[PDB]
């Protein structure tokens, strides 16, 4: 019984996780929407 | 370390495993949007 996760996942979350620690946002879930929106929008 | 971080990171990953989205970044926007609006 073996599965895996796509490449990018852990690094994707690492980037999110890093900025959480730096900025210490009051609401983690909304910070996520914002953080990831920028990623989506950056192209 | 903020409370609720580990739980958050795990929940996302688990949904990525269940649903196998093609775009992880965009699925993240949606997954976390659904989380914030779920209350």
């Amino acid at each position: 019984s073996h599965i895996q996760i796509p490449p990018g996942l852990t690094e994707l979350l690492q980037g999110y996780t890093v900025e959480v620690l730096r900025q210490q946002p009051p609401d983690l879930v909304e910070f996520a929407v914002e953080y990831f929106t920028r990623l989506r929008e950056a192209r | 370390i903020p409370p609720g971080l580990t739980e958050l990171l795990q929940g996302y990953t688990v949904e990525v495993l269940r649903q196998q989205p093609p775009d992880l970044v965009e699925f993240a926007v949606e997954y976390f949007t659904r989380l914030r609006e779920a209350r």
Binding site: I3, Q4, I5, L9, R22 | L5, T6, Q10, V14, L17
Partner: peptide
């Protein structure tokens, strides 16, 4: 900031590790 990047790496690694464990023990 270097210790911050290393810390985040572990938390993710831990969250993913448990996300895999959860999904395997959820399917079967």
């Amino acid at each position: 900031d270097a210790e911050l990047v290393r810390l985040s790496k572990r938390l993710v690694e831990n969250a993913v590790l448990k996300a895999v464990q959860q999904y395997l023990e959820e399917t079967q």
